[PDB]
């Protein structure tokens, strides 16, 4: 398995900043997007073989809304998450969906679908044996 954090290899862009104002991350801190349809986060991994991965974001949204936003692997949209509020800040939450990967290098991006952009986002998790970061093309 490999956790991808922010400012570590494996990491490409990211829209809006990084912060660390609300505590409870993992890492240096996690991505807080300007509020926007489409901001987005991007990956870069390797997997040893092409099959099916969950992966696992954990995320925080204490916000008046859910942050709907859309899981794309390279460069196909794989399913939209809804990324909900739990009105608690402090209380960070994970979502997990499941996403093919090719051998070799695979892009993941995080594509937000309403004005309030996505939720900070402070990990995504692959696990499966074989995956590790890939350079940022
Ligand atoms: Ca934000
Ligand atoms: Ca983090």
Redesign the pocket.
């Given at each position: 398995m490999w956790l991808f954090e922010e400012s570590a290899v494996g990491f490409c862009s990211n829209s809006?900043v990084i912060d660390n104002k609300h505590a409870g991350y993992t890492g240096t801190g996690f991505?807080?997007?300007?509020?926007a349809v489409g901001?987005s986060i991007v990956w870069s991994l390797s997997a040893a073989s092409a099959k099916t991965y969950t992966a696992q974001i954990r995320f925080g949204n204490g916000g008046t809304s859910a942050?709907r936003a859309t899981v794309v692997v390279n460069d196909s949209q794989i399913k939209t998450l809804d990324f909900p509020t739990n009105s608690n800040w402090t209380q960070w939450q994970t979502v997990n969906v499941d996403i093919p990967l090719k051998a070799g290098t695979n892009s993941i991006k995080l594509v937000a679908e309403t004005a309030?952009?996505?939720?900070?986002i402070d990990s995504i998790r692959v696990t499966g044996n074989g995956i590790t970061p890939a350079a940022c093309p």
């Open positions: 809006g991505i807080d997007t300007e509020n901001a942050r309030d952009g996505l939720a900070n």
